[PDB]
Design a protein around this motif. Structure first.
Motif, mmCIF file in Angstrom:
data_model
loop_
_atom_site.group_PDB
_atom_site.id
_atom_site.type_symbol
_atom_site.label_atom_id
_atom_site.label_comp_id
_atom_site.label_asym_id
_atom_site.label_seq_id
_atom_site.Cartn_x
_atom_site.Cartn_y
_atom_site.Cartn_z
ATOM 1 N N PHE A 210 3.136 -1.426 -3.403
ATOM 2 C CA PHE A 210 3.113 -2.876 -3.441
ATOM 3 C C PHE A 210 1.698 -3.340 -3.128
ATOM 4 O O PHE A 210 1.049 -2.815 -2.230
ATOM 5 C CB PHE A 210 4.076 -3.470 -2.429
ATOM 6 N N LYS A 211 1.225 -4.293 -3.910
ATOM 7 C CA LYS A 211 -0.018 -5.002 -3.610
ATOM 8 C C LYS A 211 0.260 -6.286 -2.850
ATOM 9 O O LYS A 211 1.316 -6.867 -2.978
ATOM 10 C CB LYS A 211 -0.756 -5.301 -4.914
ATOM 11 N N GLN A 212 -0.703 -6.732 -2.048
ATOM 12 C CA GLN A 212 -0.550 -7.902 -1.220
ATOM 13 C C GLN A 212 -1.594 -8.952 -1.615
ATOM 14 O O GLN A 212 -2.774 -8.656 -1.550
ATOM 15 C CB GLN A 212 -0.739 -7.497 0.247
ATOM 16 N N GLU B 44 -7.464 -9.300 -2.644
ATOM 17 C CA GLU B 44 -8.371 -9.093 -1.511
ATOM 18 C C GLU B 44 -9.855 -9.191 -1.896
ATOM 19 O O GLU B 44 -10.688 -9.511 -1.053
ATOM 20 C CB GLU B 44 -8.114 -7.721 -0.853
ATOM 21 N N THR B 45 -10.194 -8.890 -3.141
ATOM 22 C CA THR B 45 -11.607 -8.947 -3.570
ATOM 23 C C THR B 45 -12.001 -10.293 -4.191
ATOM 24 O O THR B 45 -13.158 -10.482 -4.585
ATOM 25 C CB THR B 45 -11.954 -7.837 -4.590
ATOM 26 N N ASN C 260 -5.472 0.902 4.677
ATOM 27 C CA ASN C 260 -5.868 0.104 3.510
ATOM 28 C C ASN C 260 -6.627 1.020 2.543
ATOM 29 O O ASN C 260 -7.851 1.045 2.548
ATOM 30 C CB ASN C 260 -6.714 -1.098 3.925
ATOM 31 N N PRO D 166 -8.137 -1.741 -2.552
ATOM 32 C CA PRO D 166 -8.143 -3.193 -2.447
ATOM 33 C C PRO D 166 -6.764 -3.765 -2.679
ATOM 34 O O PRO D 166 -6.026 -3.380 -3.603
ATOM 35 C CB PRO D 166 -9.125 -3.626 -3.548
ATOM 36 N N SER D 167 -6.403 -4.664 -1.796
ATOM 37 C CA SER D 167 -5.135 -5.380 -1.864
ATOM 38 C C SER D 167 -3.934 -4.470 -1.569
ATOM 39 O O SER D 167 -2.794 -4.890 -1.750
ATOM 40 C CB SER D 167 -4.930 -6.059 -3.243
ATOM 41 N N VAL D 168 -4.170 -3.255 -1.088
ATOM 42 C CA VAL D 168 -3.031 -2.404 -0.713
ATOM 43 C C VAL D 168 -3.084 -2.189 0.810
ATOM 44 O O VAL D 168 -4.076 -1.680 1.326
ATOM 45 C CB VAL D 168 -3.044 -1.094 -1.468
ATOM 46 N N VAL D 169 -2.047 -2.633 1.510
ATOM 47 C CA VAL D 169 -1.914 -2.406 2.946
ATOM 48 C C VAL D 169 -0.582 -1.690 3.158
ATOM 49 O O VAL D 169 0.442 -2.177 2.703
ATOM 50 C CB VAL D 169 -1.907 -3.719 3.788
ATOM 51 N N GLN E 143 1.952 0.480 6.059
ATOM 52 C CA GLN E 143 2.242 0.909 7.411
ATOM 53 C C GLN E 143 3.151 2.115 7.326
ATOM 54 O O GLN E 143 4.142 2.061 6.576
ATOM 55 C CB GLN E 143 2.925 -0.171 8.212
#
Lengths: 141, 141
Positions: free
Chosen positions: A73-75, A91-92, B58, B61-64, B66
């Motif tokens: 999943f991307k956020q 994010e970029t 991370n 980019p745009s992937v976080v 847990q």
């Protein structure tokens, strides 16, 4: 991209990749012949049913593992909410002007509520299917 | 060994490694300050309580993501059942004469029933803690 998920961590409602498609799991069963698990799911984009059986590996003596794939999943940040779609940013800083939001479990309504109360803190979780992106859940960071 | 498990696939009752110990998860909560998940669990060997917070990565980019660690379960054949312990054999033929069985959810009784009805088909799933092995669940292959 995808992540490998052990079958004993898969429950009804989880999202998996089935027949190359992201799907919500609605039935889990076990093959009497092979011991594989079988997953029946609903395609998040087309709403068609797909089934796939698990992959059985033996990476070492006395270790047997069954896995399935799940999506990465991307956020994205939410910049605006327009008409059933959102303006999102990566994010970029890459801007996505008309990102669709899935009709599942009242996500549009939940997202709206959290946006009007704390815009900068809301994130959407996004799945990709061969180019096409859709928001399928949300987070508050 | 261990396997990396995404936090959205962890539920109450799952086994994780907490503070280096295999534990059954009994409470999940979220840190207001950091967004990390916190897991409270019961040590399978000593029955003491341990807590650990998730690891946030991370990787793009745009992937976080847990994650937490879970144990890699080994699968042994059952050759004999003696007195609260079993004689087990590994896939390569290594014999383990006095392997203990956990007192959790009536596993001893379930194992006994399946053994007397189909010996050659039963397997135990085994966890290791720094040398010490214990059977913590069972399978019929």
């Amino acid at each position: 991209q995808t992540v490998t998920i052990p079958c004993h961590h898969i429950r009804l409602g989880d999202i998996l990749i089935l027949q190359g498609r992201p799907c919500q799991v609605i039935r889990i069963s076990t093959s009497a012949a092979t011991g594989q698990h079988r997953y029946l799911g609903v395609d998040l984009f087309t709403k068609q049913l797909h089934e796939e059986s698990s992959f059985v590996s033996n990476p070492a003596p006395s270790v047997v593992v069954q896995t399935m794939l799940g999506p990465v999943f991307k956020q994205y940040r939410v910049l605006d909410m327009q008409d059933g779609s959102i303006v999102a940013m990566t994010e970029t800083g890459d801007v996505k002007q008309n990102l669709p939001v899935i009709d599942q479990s009242s996500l549009w309504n939940r997202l709206q509520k959290a946006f009007e109360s704390g815009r900068g803190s809301v994130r959407v979780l996004v799945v990709s299917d061969h180019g096409r992106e859709m928001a399928v859940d949300m987070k508050v960071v």
